């Protein structure tokens, strides 16, 4: 029974509007409706992992699990196993997987973050799940961010609190937040970003939706514009949106957008918006391909339509050699040449690096770099040829070329990370000096760059 090198992952996000679902929700898991939809010929083919995010979910975990498992069984004839379920208030995440994966999935972790203070603490935040799938780490975040067209900045703040404080994945990766801890990270939910057009244009927007002319609406989508200006979700991907706005509908039909201000909305307009989103971030040069991104047309119990996205995701096998795990493989080494970090910091402390990777027995601390002034004001930290030679646990190229090195640049004074990034070992050549590069972030914001050269020695 061979270990897979690809799996498919279903991501669902649905704000249920505090209403029980209708009796049939199979269209969601089949990626049928509007947008980038799944071919009919695939309907019986189960995804490897289904990750369901709900917001305003009125069901118990038991009630929702029963509905999900019965849905998937009807579609696939497979009885899925529950990997994890985690609920904060009415925000929920469920992970289901094919039974054949039960002994491929380990290190299952759940957490939540509550966003806001006093007034704004009580119903918004995020839940998440992480685990290993063979040699691949997977993380999943379902967030319900602050609502309202005039709160895009609050949403961006909610994003940064969630990526800082959600404690998923390997805690030995202490300098790294969730945006670096996983081979593949999927972040979805009712992100609540709106189409920022004047209230007076509501009927014009509705017209555009009826014509399936989304271009002039998406050009005003706050998540697309905030992402373009690097205010949120830096280094994440989103598939092109080709489905109608998923909010705000009159219930029991999809024929009407309910946008006008009401006491029940706090006298706020809800112009048709793409509130419900799926984004991802995978390590460099790992296979990840979005195969669907759309909304259902036939599930109408909520003022939101469910969103689906499916992905091909590259996975690696749990590698065993005669040497590693449990020793090094003398035949393997990673060398860094002519490396320098460029930092946006106004601080003058010395900096050192940490290299973290599953291909190492434990992380490696460098010597301090040499600070110089860059020509445009920047701090440049030069490492020269001073960086430690990394000793991977396995030298086999089939293993080593699939690995990644996380880099943190830390202050000598405070041991606080000023920047985090990631370097793929999927090189064009071994035993060859080759350029490497990663942006550096801290709390998910750009703080600099790391670049230089690598020379990778494998047993071939
Ligand atoms: C909690 C956790 C740990 C972990 N690792 C990788 C295997 N060895 C132990 C450390 N990986 C993930 C995704 N989560
Ligand atoms: C034009 C553009 C590109 C981008 N990328 C691309 C490669 N990795 C993820 C980040 N993100 C945005 C918001 N805009």
3-state secondary structure the chain: CCCCCEEEEEEEEEECCCCCCCCCCHHHHCCCCEEECCCHHHCCCCCCEEEEEEECCCCCHHHHHHHHHHHHHHHHCCCCEEEEEEEECCEEEEEEECHHHCCCEEEEEEEEEECCCCCCCCCCEEEEEEEEECCEEEEEEEEECCCCCCCHHHHHHHHHHHHHHCCCCCCCCCCCCHHHHCCEEEEEEECCCCECCCHHHHHHHHHHHHCCCCHHHHCCEHHHHHHHCCCCCCCCECCCCCCCCCECECCCCCCCECCCCCHHHCCCCCCCECCEEEEEEECCCCCEEEEEEEECCCCCCCCCCCEEEEEEEECCCCCCCCCCCCCCCCCCEEEEEEEEEEECCCCCCCEEEEEECCCCCCCEEEEECEEEECCCCCEEEEEECCCCCECCCCCCHHHHCCCEEEEEEEECCCCCEEEEEEEECCCCCCCCCEEEEEEEEECCEEEEEEEEEEEEECCC
The finding on whether 107 has its CB within 6 A of some atom of ligand 1 is yes
Q: Which of 221, 223, 224, 227 to mutate to test the pocket of ligand 2 (most atoms within 8 A of CB)?
A: 227
What is the distance between the alpha carbons of residues 296 and 172, in angstroms, rounded to a whole number?
A: 40
Q: CB atoms < 10 A from the CB of 253, how many?
A: 8
State whether 310 and 451 are in the same domain: no
**Pick from 408, 386, 378, 373: which is nearest to 339 by CA?**
386
State whether 303 and 383 are in the same domain: no
For the chain, the domain total comes to 2
Half-sphere exposure of 416 (CA within 13 A, CB side): 9
Query: What residues contact 1, with CB distance under 8 A and at least 6 apart?
Result: 100
Query: After which residues is the chain discontinuous, taking C to N > 2.5 Å?
Result: none
State whether 209 and 340 are in the same domain: no
State whether 395 and 302 are in the same domain: no
CA angle 208, 150, 261 (to 5 degrees): 65
Q: Using the mean position of ligand 2's atoms as its centre, give its distance from the Cα of residue 284 in Å.
A: 13
Let me know: does 165 contact 143? Beta carbons within 8 Å: no
**Pick from 88, 69, 98: which is nearest to 1 by CA?**
98
State whether 319 and 378 are in the same domain: no
**Pick from 252, 248, 255, 251: which is nearest to 271 by CA?**
248
CA angle 239, 291, 67 (to 5 degrees): 100
Per the structure block, which two tokens stand in for 58? 């009125």
State whether 256 and 287 are in the same domain: yes
Range of the domain at 171: 1-325
CA distances to 287, 392, 402 from 5, in Å: 10, 22, 11
CA distances to 80, 172, 314, 381 from 6, in Å: 19, 27, 5, 39
Per the structure block, which two tokens stand in for 297? 């047309």
Per the structure block, which two tokens stand in for 270? 């809800």
Query: What residues contact 223, with CB distance under 8 A and at least 6 apart?
Result: 191, 193, 232, 233, 238, 274, 277
Final residue in a domain of this structure, among 325, 342, 375: 325
Per the structure block, which two tokens stand in for 350? 């010395």
State whether 309 and 430 are in the same domain: no
State whether 320 and 422 are in the same domain: no
The residue whose CA has the least distance to atom 10 of ligand 1 is 170
The finding on whether 46 has its CB within 6 A of some atom of ligand 1 is no
Let me know: does 328 contact 361? Beta carbons within 8 Å: yes
What is the distance between the alpha carbons of residues 182 and 200, in angstroms, rounded to a whole number?
A: 44
Q: Which of 186, 228, 282, 445 to mutate to test the pocket of ligand 2 (most atoms within 8 A of CB)?
A: 228
- Technique employed here was X-ray
Terminal-residue alpha carbon distance, the chain:
27
**Pick from 169, 188, 9: which is nearest to 91 by CA?**
188
Per the structure block, which two tokens stand in for 173? 């990766």
Q: Which of 191, 236, 277 to mutate to test the pocket of ligand 2 (most atoms within 8 A of CB)?
A: 236
What is the distance between the alpha carbons of residues 49 and 52, in angstroms, rounded to a whole number?
A: 10
CA distances to 335, 356, 442, 454 from 370, in Å: 18, 22, 21, 19
What is the distance between the alpha carbons of residues 390 and 29, in angstroms, rounded to a whole number?
A: 44
**Pick from 276, 261, 245: which is nearest to 200 by CA?**
261
Per the structure block, which two tokens stand in for 460? 């071939």
Ligand nearest the Cα atom of residue 182? 1
305 alpha-carbon distance from chain centroid: 21
Strands 34-36, 81-88: pairing kind: unpaired
Half-sphere exposure of 172 (CA within 13 A, CB side): 10
List residues bridging with 318 in a β-sheet: none
State whether 420 and 295 are in the same domain: no
Final residue in a domain of this structure, among 298, 325, 352: 325
> Would you state the torsion angle of the CA atoms of residues 91, 92, 93, 94, taken in this order, to the nearest 10 degrees?
-170
What is the distance between the alpha carbons of residues 10 and 50, in angstroms, rounded to a whole number?
A: 5
State whether 46 and 123 are in the same domain: yes
Strands 6-15, 49-55: pairing kind: parallel
State whether 347 and 236 are in the same domain: no
Ligand nearest the Cα atom of residue 168? 1
The finding on whether 228 has its CB within 6 A of some atom of ligand 2 is yes
Strands 364-368, 351-356: pairing kind: antiparallel
What is the distance between the alpha carbons of residues 137 and 133, in angstroms, rounded to a whole number?
A: 6
CA angle 240, 444, 179 (to 5 degrees): 70
367 alpha-carbon distance from chain centroid: 33
Q: Using the mean position of ligand 1's atoms as its centre, give its distance from the Cα of residue 170 in Å.
A: 4
What is the distance between the alpha carbons of residues 345 and 356, in angstroms, rounded to a whole number?
A: 23
Final residue in a domain of this structure, among 264, 292, 325: 325
Over the Cα atoms of the chain, what is R_g? 23
The residue whose CA has the least distance to atom 11 of ligand 1 is 170
State whether 309 and 411 are in the same domain: no
What is the distance between the alpha carbons of residues 191 and 378, in angstroms, rounded to a whole number?
A: 35
* 180 phi/psi in degrees, rounded to 5: -130, -5
What is the distance between the alpha carbons of residues 367 and 351, in angstroms, rounded to a whole number?
A: 8
């Amino acid at each position: 029974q061979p270990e897979p090198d690809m799996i498919t992952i279903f991501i669902g996000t649905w704000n249920m509007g505090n209403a029980p679902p209708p009796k049939k929700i199979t269209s969601w898991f089949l990626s049928k409706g509007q947008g980038k939809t799944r071919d009919d010929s695939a309907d019986y083919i189960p995804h490897d992992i289904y990750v369901i995010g709900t917001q305003e979910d009125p069901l118990s975990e038991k009630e929702w699990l029963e509905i999900l498992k019965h849905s998937l069984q009807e579609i696939t004839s497979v009885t899925f196993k529950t990997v994890a379920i985690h609920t904060l208030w009415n925000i929920r995440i469920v992970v289901l997987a094919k039974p054949e994966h039960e002994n491929r999935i380990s290190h299952i972790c759940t957490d939540n973050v509550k966003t806001g203070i006093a007034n704004t603490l009580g119903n918004k935040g995020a839940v998440g799940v992480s685990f290993m799938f063979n040699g691949t780490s997977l993380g999943f975040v379902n967030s319900h961010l602050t609502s309202g067209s005039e709160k895009k900045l609050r949403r961006n703040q909610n994003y940064m609190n969630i990526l800082r404080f959600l404690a998923l994945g390997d805690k030995k990766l202490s300098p790294f937040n969730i945006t670096h801890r996983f081979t593949h990270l999927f972040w979805f939910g009712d992100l609540n970003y709106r189409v920022d057009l004047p209230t007076w244009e509501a009927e014009t927007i509705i017209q555009k939706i009826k014509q399936q002319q989304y271009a002039d609406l998406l050009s005003h989508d706050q998540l697309l514009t905030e992402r373009r200006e690097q205010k949120v979700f830096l280094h994440f991907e989103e598939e092109e949106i080709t489905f109608a706005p998923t909010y705000r509908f009159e219930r029991l039909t999809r024929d009407k957008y309910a946008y006008t201000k009401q006491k029940a909305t706090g006298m706020k307009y809800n112009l048709p918006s793409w509130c419900d989103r799926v984004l991802w971030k995978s390590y460099p040069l790992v296979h990840v391909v979005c195969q669907s991104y759309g909304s259902t047309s036939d599930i109408m119990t909520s003022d939101h339509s469910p969103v689906f996205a499916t992905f091909e995701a590259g996975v690696t096998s749990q590698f065993v050699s005669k040497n590693g795990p449990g020793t090094v493989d003398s035949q393997g080494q990673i060398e860094f040449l002519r490396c320098y970090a460029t930092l946006k910091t106004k601080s003058q402390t010395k900096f050192y690096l940490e290299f973290h990777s599953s291909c190492l027995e434990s992380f490696v601390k460098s010597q301090e770099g040499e600070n110089e002034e860059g020509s445009e004001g920047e701090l440049v930290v030069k490492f020269g040829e001073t960086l430690p030679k990394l000793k991977p646990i396995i030298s086999d190229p089939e293993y080593l070329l699939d690995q990644h090195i996380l880099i943190s640049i830390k202050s000598s004074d405070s041991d606080e990370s000023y920047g985090e990034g990631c370097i793929a070992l999927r090189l064009e050549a071994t035993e060859t000096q080759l350029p490497i590069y990663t942006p550096l972030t801290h709390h998910g914001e750009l703080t600099g760059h790391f670049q230089g050269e690598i020379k990778l020695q494998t047993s071939q």
